[PDB]
Amino acid sequence: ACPAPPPGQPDIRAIGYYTDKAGSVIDPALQQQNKDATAPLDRYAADVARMSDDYLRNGDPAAAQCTLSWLGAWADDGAMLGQMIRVNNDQSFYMRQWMLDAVAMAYLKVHDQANPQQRARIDPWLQKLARANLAYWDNPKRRRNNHYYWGGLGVLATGLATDDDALWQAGHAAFQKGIDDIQDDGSLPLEMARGQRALHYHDYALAPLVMMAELARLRGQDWYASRNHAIDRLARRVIEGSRDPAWFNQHTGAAQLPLQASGWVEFYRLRSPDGGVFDAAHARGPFHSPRLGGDLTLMATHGIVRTP
Ligand SMILES: O=C(O)[C@H]1O[C@@H](O[C@H]2[C@H](O)[C@H](O)[C@H](O[C@H]3[C@H](O)[C@H](O)[C@H](O)O[C@@H]3C(=O)O)O[C@@H]2C(=O)O)[C@@H](O)[C@@H](O)[C@@H]1O
Protein backbone atom coordinates (compact mmCIF):
# COMPACT_ATOMS: atom_id res chain seq x y z
CA ALA A 1 0.00 0.00 0.00
CA CYS A 2 3.11 2.31 -0.17
CA PRO A 3 3.57 3.03 -3.93
CA ALA A 4 7.08 2.82 -5.48
CA PRO A 5 9.13 6.04 -5.34
CA PRO A 6 10.70 7.25 -8.61
CA PRO A 7 14.44 6.48 -8.71
CA GLY A 8 16.63 9.21 -7.11
CA GLN A 9 18.99 10.85 -9.68
CA PRO A 10 22.35 11.97 -8.17
CA ASP A 11 22.63 14.80 -10.83
CA ILE A 12 20.37 17.89 -11.51
CA ARG A 13 20.30 19.77 -14.86
CA ALA A 14 17.80 22.66 -14.51
CA ILE A 15 17.76 25.69 -16.89
CA GLY A 16 17.52 29.49 -16.30
CA TYR A 17 14.64 31.11 -18.25
CA TYR A 18 15.12 34.92 -17.80
CA THR A 19 16.57 36.92 -20.78
CA ASP A 20 16.96 40.37 -19.15
CA LYS A 21 19.34 41.82 -16.47
CA ALA A 22 16.35 42.36 -14.06
CA GLY A 23 15.46 38.59 -14.17
CA SER A 24 11.79 39.56 -14.99
CA VAL A 25 11.25 38.66 -18.72
CA ILE A 26 10.66 34.92 -19.43
CA ASP A 27 11.75 33.01 -22.59
CA PRO A 28 8.68 30.71 -22.90
CA ALA A 29 10.93 28.12 -24.67
CA LEU A 30 13.54 28.13 -21.80
CA GLN A 31 10.70 28.02 -19.13
CA GLN A 32 9.32 24.84 -20.89
CA GLN A 33 12.83 23.21 -21.02
CA ASN A 34 13.29 23.82 -17.22
CA LYS A 35 9.68 22.63 -16.54
CA ASP A 36 10.37 19.32 -18.43
CA ALA A 37 13.91 18.82 -16.99
CA THR A 38 12.68 19.31 -13.36
CA ALA A 39 9.22 17.57 -13.64
CA PRO A 40 10.51 14.37 -11.92
CA LEU A 41 12.06 16.41 -9.03
CA ASP A 42 8.82 18.49 -8.65
CA ARG A 43 6.66 15.27 -8.73
CA TYR A 44 8.72 13.68 -5.87
CA ALA A 45 8.49 17.00 -3.91
CA ALA A 46 4.66 17.18 -4.31
CA ASP A 47 4.29 13.46 -3.44
CA VAL A 48 6.23 13.56 -0.08
CA ALA A 49 4.50 16.93 0.60
CA ARG A 50 1.09 15.24 -0.04
CA MET A 51 1.72 12.03 1.99
CA SER A 52 3.13 14.09 4.95
CA ASP A 53 0.04 16.37 4.53
CA ASP A 54 -2.15 13.19 4.69
CA TYR A 55 -0.36 12.21 7.93
CA LEU A 56 -0.90 15.68 9.56
CA ARG A 57 -4.62 15.60 8.47
CA ASN A 58 -5.81 12.25 10.00
CA GLY A 59 -2.80 10.90 12.03
CA ASP A 60 -2.78 7.63 9.99
CA PRO A 61 0.79 6.21 10.54
CA ALA A 62 0.69 4.37 7.14
CA ALA A 63 0.98 7.78 5.35
CA ALA A 64 3.93 8.71 7.67
CA GLN A 65 5.59 5.24 7.02
CA CYS A 66 5.13 5.73 3.21
CA THR A 67 6.65 9.28 3.45
CA LEU A 68 9.63 7.87 5.43
CA SER A 69 10.01 4.96 2.92
CA TRP A 70 10.23 7.42 -0.04
CA LEU A 71 12.73 9.68 1.82
CA GLY A 72 14.78 6.54 2.76
CA ALA A 73 14.77 5.37 -0.90
CA TRP A 74 16.18 8.70 -2.27
CA ALA A 75 18.77 8.72 0.62
CA ASP A 76 20.03 5.16 -0.29
CA ASP A 77 20.11 6.28 -4.00
CA GLY A 78 22.19 9.38 -2.94
CA ALA A 79 19.55 11.59 -4.73
CA MET A 80 20.92 15.10 -5.64
CA LEU A 81 24.44 14.42 -4.09
CA GLY A 82 26.09 14.43 -7.57
CA GLN A 83 26.64 17.19 -10.14
CA MET A 84 24.74 20.50 -10.18
CA ILE A 85 25.17 20.89 -14.01
CA ARG A 86 25.43 24.58 -14.99
CA VAL A 87 23.52 25.29 -18.30
CA ASN A 88 22.94 29.10 -18.50
CA ASN A 89 22.97 29.93 -14.68
CA ASP A 90 22.99 28.31 -11.13
CA GLN A 91 19.42 26.85 -11.54
CA SER A 92 20.55 23.26 -10.73
CA PHE A 93 21.89 24.52 -7.34
CA TYR A 94 18.68 26.53 -6.70
CA MET A 95 16.70 23.28 -7.32
CA ARG A 96 18.89 21.42 -4.73
CA GLN A 97 17.97 24.15 -2.21
CA TRP A 98 14.25 24.05 -3.16
CA MET A 99 14.23 20.20 -3.10
CA LEU A 100 15.98 20.09 0.35
CA ASP A 101 13.24 22.46 1.55
CA ALA A 102 10.48 20.04 0.38
CA VAL A 103 12.12 16.77 1.57
CA ALA A 104 13.44 18.27 4.91
CA MET A 105 9.99 19.73 5.72
CA ALA A 106 8.23 16.46 4.71
CA TYR A 107 10.67 14.50 6.96
CA LEU A 108 10.04 16.89 9.85
CA LYS A 109 6.22 16.45 9.51
CA VAL A 110 6.48 12.58 9.81
CA HIS A 111 9.62 12.57 12.06
CA ASP A 112 7.63 11.27 15.17
CA GLN A 113 6.94 7.91 13.29
CA ALA A 114 10.55 7.39 12.02
CA ASN A 115 12.34 4.29 13.46
CA PRO A 116 16.11 4.19 14.24
CA GLN A 117 16.85 2.43 10.88
CA GLN A 118 15.00 5.29 9.02
CA ARG A 119 16.70 8.19 10.95
CA ALA A 120 20.12 6.53 10.26
CA ARG A 121 19.50 6.50 6.44
CA ILE A 122 17.68 9.88 6.03
CA ASP A 123 19.55 12.14 8.57
CA PRO A 124 23.03 11.82 6.93
CA TRP A 125 21.52 12.50 3.49
CA LEU A 126 19.63 15.68 4.63
CA GLN A 127 22.82 16.78 6.51
CA LYS A 128 24.92 16.34 3.29
CA LEU A 129 22.45 18.31 1.08
CA ALA A 130 22.32 20.94 3.91
CA ARG A 131 26.14 21.39 4.20
CA ALA A 132 26.49 21.46 0.33
CA ASN A 133 23.78 24.23 0.01
CA LEU A 134 25.60 26.12 2.85
CA ALA A 135 29.08 25.92 1.17
CA TYR A 136 27.70 27.68 -2.00
CA TRP A 137 27.06 30.74 0.28
CA ASP A 138 30.57 30.74 1.94
CA ASN A 139 31.69 32.52 -1.33
CA PRO A 140 31.21 36.31 -0.86
CA LYS A 141 30.70 36.75 -4.68
CA ARG A 142 27.26 35.00 -4.33
CA ARG A 143 24.40 37.60 -4.08
CA ARG A 144 22.37 36.83 -0.85
CA ASN A 145 18.86 37.66 -2.23
CA ASN A 146 15.74 35.48 -1.71
CA HIS A 147 17.81 32.39 -2.85
CA TYR A 148 19.76 32.61 0.44
CA TYR A 149 16.44 32.64 2.39
CA TRP A 150 15.12 29.55 0.52
CA GLY A 151 18.52 27.90 1.11
CA GLY A 152 18.15 28.75 4.84
CA LEU A 153 14.70 27.07 5.16
CA GLY A 154 16.06 23.60 4.16
CA VAL A 155 19.23 23.94 6.29
CA LEU A 156 17.03 25.08 9.25
CA ALA A 157 14.54 22.18 8.74
CA THR A 158 17.47 19.63 8.51
CA GLY A 159 19.12 21.05 11.68
CA LEU A 160 15.79 20.70 13.54
CA ALA A 161 14.80 17.20 12.23
CA THR A 162 18.34 15.66 12.50
CA ASP A 163 19.23 17.55 15.75
CA ASP A 164 22.36 19.25 14.20
CA ASP A 165 23.14 22.51 16.12
CA ALA A 166 25.54 23.95 13.43
CA LEU A 167 22.85 23.72 10.66
CA TRP A 168 20.26 25.28 13.04
CA GLN A 169 22.56 28.32 13.64
CA ALA A 170 23.45 28.56 9.90
CA GLY A 171 19.70 28.53 9.05
CA HIS A 172 19.15 31.28 11.70
CA ALA A 173 21.90 33.26 9.90
CA ALA A 174 19.95 33.02 6.55
CA PHE A 175 16.74 34.17 8.36
CA GLN A 176 18.64 37.03 10.12
CA LYS A 177 20.14 38.36 6.84
CA GLY A 178 16.62 38.50 5.26
CA ILE A 179 15.24 40.46 8.26
CA ASP A 180 18.37 42.73 8.29
CA ASP A 181 17.67 43.41 4.53
CA ILE A 182 14.13 44.86 5.27
CA GLN A 183 14.24 48.69 4.87
CA ASP A 184 11.87 51.05 6.89
CA ASP A 185 9.40 51.02 3.89
CA GLY A 186 9.33 47.15 4.02
CA SER A 187 11.29 46.75 0.71
CA LEU A 188 14.21 44.35 0.04
CA PRO A 189 16.79 46.25 -2.09
CA LEU A 190 17.89 43.20 -4.16
CA GLU A 191 14.21 42.25 -4.87
CA MET A 192 13.43 45.95 -5.84
CA ALA A 193 15.70 45.35 -8.90
CA ARG A 194 13.38 42.63 -10.42
CA GLY A 195 11.27 45.32 -12.23
CA GLN A 196 8.00 43.76 -13.43
CA ARG A 197 8.39 40.87 -10.90
CA ALA A 198 9.54 43.03 -7.90
CA LEU A 199 6.26 42.49 -5.99
CA HIS A 200 6.42 38.73 -6.79
CA TYR A 201 10.05 38.52 -5.44
CA HIS A 202 9.07 40.42 -2.24
CA ASP A 203 6.29 37.83 -1.61
CA TYR A 204 8.75 35.05 -2.67
CA ALA A 205 11.47 36.31 -0.26
CA LEU A 206 8.95 36.58 2.63
CA ALA A 207 7.44 33.05 2.42
CA PRO A 208 10.64 31.19 3.56
CA LEU A 209 11.39 33.87 6.23
CA VAL A 210 7.92 33.19 7.75
CA MET A 211 8.42 29.36 7.58
CA MET A 212 11.88 29.72 9.20
CA ALA A 213 10.18 31.81 11.97
CA GLU A 214 7.63 28.94 12.29
CA LEU A 215 10.42 26.30 12.64
CA ALA A 216 11.97 28.49 15.44
CA ARG A 217 8.57 28.50 17.16
CA LEU A 218 8.61 24.63 17.21
CA ARG A 219 11.91 24.86 19.15
CA GLY A 220 10.31 27.50 21.51
CA GLN A 221 12.11 30.58 20.03
CA ASP A 222 10.43 33.84 18.78
CA TRP A 223 12.35 35.24 15.74
CA TYR A 224 9.27 37.25 14.55
CA ALA A 225 10.28 40.08 17.02
CA SER A 226 13.77 40.51 15.37
CA ARG A 227 14.84 44.17 14.59
CA ASN A 228 11.52 45.56 16.05
CA HIS A 229 9.15 43.31 14.00
CA ALA A 230 10.94 44.17 10.68
CA ILE A 231 9.14 41.18 9.03
CA ASP A 232 5.82 43.05 9.60
CA ARG A 233 6.94 45.80 7.16
CA LEU A 234 7.72 43.25 4.42
CA ALA A 235 4.41 41.43 5.18
CA ARG A 236 2.35 44.72 5.10
CA ARG A 237 4.34 45.91 2.03
CA VAL A 238 3.59 42.61 0.21
CA ILE A 239 -0.14 42.47 1.19
CA GLU A 240 -0.54 46.21 0.21
CA GLY A 241 1.13 45.27 -3.13
CA SER A 242 -1.25 42.32 -3.84
CA ARG A 243 -4.24 44.74 -3.32
CA ASP A 244 -2.68 47.75 -5.28
CA PRO A 245 0.72 47.57 -7.09
CA ALA A 246 1.02 51.41 -7.37
CA TRP A 247 3.89 51.77 -4.82
CA PHE A 248 5.86 49.02 -6.67
CA ASN A 249 4.89 50.57 -10.07
CA GLN A 250 6.37 53.95 -9.00
CA HIS A 251 9.41 52.62 -7.05
CA THR A 252 10.63 50.31 -9.90
CA GLY A 253 9.13 52.28 -12.82
CA ALA A 254 7.72 48.91 -14.05
CA ALA A 255 4.03 47.82 -14.22
CA GLN A 256 3.90 44.91 -11.74
CA LEU A 257 2.58 41.61 -13.18
CA PRO A 258 -0.61 40.30 -11.50
CA LEU A 259 0.00 38.77 -8.00
CA GLN A 260 -1.87 37.11 -5.07
CA ALA A 261 -0.01 36.66 -1.72
CA SER A 262 1.42 33.10 -1.16
CA GLY A 263 0.68 30.70 1.74
CA TRP A 264 2.84 32.52 4.35
CA VAL A 265 -0.40 34.46 5.16
CA GLU A 266 -1.83 31.28 6.81
CA PHE A 267 0.91 31.46 9.48
CA TYR A 268 1.46 35.24 9.56
CA ARG A 269 -2.23 36.24 10.32
CA LEU A 270 -2.11 34.01 13.47
CA ARG A 271 1.16 35.58 14.79
CA SER A 272 0.39 39.24 13.78
CA PRO A 273 -3.17 39.72 12.37
CA ASP A 274 -2.67 43.53 12.11
CA GLY A 275 -6.51 44.13 12.32
CA GLY A 276 -7.32 41.48 9.63
CA VAL A 277 -5.28 42.82 6.60
CA PHE A 278 -4.28 39.18 5.67
CA ASP A 279 -7.89 37.75 5.95
CA ALA A 280 -8.73 38.45 2.23
CA ALA A 281 -5.65 36.36 1.16
CA HIS A 282 -6.55 33.62 3.72
CA ALA A 283 -10.08 33.37 2.12
CA ARG A 284 -8.38 32.36 -1.22
CA GLY A 285 -6.90 29.23 0.49
CA PRO A 286 -6.13 26.51 1.10
CA PHE A 287 -2.44 27.02 0.06
CA HIS A 288 -0.32 24.05 -1.19
CA SER A 289 3.44 24.72 -1.65
CA PRO A 290 5.67 21.60 -1.50
CA ARG A 291 8.93 23.70 -1.29
CA LEU A 292 7.50 25.43 1.86
CA GLY A 293 6.36 22.06 3.33
CA GLY A 294 3.06 21.43 1.48
CA ASP A 295 -0.36 22.35 2.94
CA LEU A 296 0.36 25.69 4.69
CA THR A 297 -3.36 26.01 5.70
CA LEU A 298 -3.32 22.58 7.46
CA MET A 299 0.10 23.24 9.10
CA ALA A 300 -0.88 26.86 10.11
CA THR A 301 -4.15 25.58 11.72
CA HIS A 302 -2.92 22.27 13.27
CA GLY A 303 0.90 22.55 13.53
CA ILE A 304 3.85 21.55 11.32
CA VAL A 305 4.21 18.52 13.69
CA ARG A 306 1.44 16.43 15.34
CA THR A 307 3.63 16.10 18.54
CA PRO A 308 6.53 18.36 19.78
O1 LIG B 1 5.36 29.19 -13.20
C1 LIG B 1 5.35 29.28 -11.96
O2 LIG B 1 4.76 30.21 -11.35
C2 LIG B 1 6.14 28.23 -11.21
O3 LIG B 1 6.76 28.88 -10.09
C3 LIG B 1 7.92 28.14 -9.65
O4 LIG B 1 8.72 28.77 -8.63
C4 LIG B 1 9.62 29.77 -9.09
C5 LIG B 1 9.57 30.91 -8.09
O5 LIG B 1 8.28 31.44 -8.02
C6 LIG B 1 10.55 32.06 -8.38
O6 LIG B 1 10.10 32.92 -9.44
C7 LIG B 1 11.93 31.47 -8.68
O7 LIG B 1 12.79 32.54 -9.11
C8 LIG B 1 14.16 32.22 -9.38
C9 LIG B 1 14.36 31.80 -10.86
O8 LIG B 1 14.01 30.44 -11.12
C10 LIG B 1 15.79 32.04 -11.32
O9 LIG B 1 16.71 31.21 -10.58
C11 LIG B 1 16.07 33.51 -11.06
O10 LIG B 1 17.17 33.98 -11.81
O11 LIG B 1 16.28 33.54 -9.62
C12 LIG B 1 14.94 33.52 -9.08
C13 LIG B 1 14.88 33.94 -7.66
O12 LIG B 1 14.43 33.20 -6.75
O13 LIG B 1 15.23 35.11 -7.48
O14 LIG B 1 11.83 30.39 -9.61
C14 LIG B 1 11.07 29.26 -9.14
C15 LIG B 1 11.29 28.07 -10.05
O15 LIG B 1 10.98 26.93 -9.68
O16 LIG B 1 11.83 28.23 -11.17
C16 LIG B 1 7.42 26.79 -9.09
O17 LIG B 1 6.81 26.99 -7.78
C17 LIG B 1 6.51 26.06 -10.11
O18 LIG B 1 6.07 24.86 -9.44
C18 LIG B 1 5.38 26.97 -10.71
O19 LIG B 1 4.52 26.31 -11.71
Numbering used by the authors: 22 to 329
Paper text:
Unlike other PLs, Smlt1473 present in the clinically relevant Stenotrophomonas maltophilia strain K279a demonstrates a wide range of pH-dependent substrate specificities toward multiple, diverse polysaccharides: hyaluronic acid (pH 5.0), poly-β-D-glucuronic (celluronic) acid (pH 7.0), poly-β-D-mannuronic acid, and poly-α-L-guluronate (pH 9.0). To decode the pH-driven multiple substrate specificities and selectivity in this single enzyme, we present the X-ray structures of Smlt1473 determined at multiple pH values in apo and mannuronate-bound states as well as the tetra-hyaluronate-docked structure. We have built and refined the structures from residues A22-L330; electron density for other residues outside this range was either weak or absent. The structure is composed of 13 α-helical segments (α-1 to α-13) connected by 14 loops (L-1 to L-14) and two β-strands (β-1 and β-2) (Fig. 2, B and C (i and ii)).
The strict pH-dependent mechanism of substrate turnover further allowed us to generate arrested Michaels–Menten complexes for wild-type Smlt1473-ManA at catalytically inactive pH 5.0 and 7.0 in order to determine specific molecular interactions responsible for binding versus catalysis. In particular, we cocrystallized tetra-ManA and hexa-ManA, at pH 5.0 and 7.0, respectively; note that maximal specific activity for poly-ManA is at pH 9.0. However, in both pH 5.0 and pH 7.0 cocrystal structures, we were able to model only three sugar units of ManA at [+1, −1, −2] subsites. For the pH 5.0 cocrystallized structure, at the entry site the residues that lie in 5.0-Å vicinity of the substrates are Q52, K56, D63, R312, H221, and R218. Y222, which is the catalytic proton donor/acceptor within the active site, forms two H-bonded interactions of 2.9 and 2.7 Å, respectively, each with O2 of BEM701 and the O4 of the cleavable glycosidic bond between BEM701 and BEM601, consistent with its role in catalysis. Among these, R215 with its NH1 group forms a salt-bridge interaction of 2.9 Å with O6B of BEM601, thus complementing N167 in neutralizing the carboxylic group. Comparatively, the pH 5.0 cocrystallized ManA structure has more (11 H-bonds, three salt bridges) and shorter noncovalent interactions than pH 7.0 cocrystallized ManA structure (ten H-bonds, two salt bridges) at the [−1, +1] subsite. At the exit site, the residues involved in direct H-bond and Van der Waals interactions with substrate at the +1 subsite have high (N110, Q112, Y115, N166, N167, H168, E212, R215) atomic fluctuations for pH 7.0 bound structure, in contrast to pH 5.0 bound structure. These observations imply that substrate binding at the [−1, +1] subsite is much tighter in terms of atomic fluctuations for the pH 5.0 bound structure.
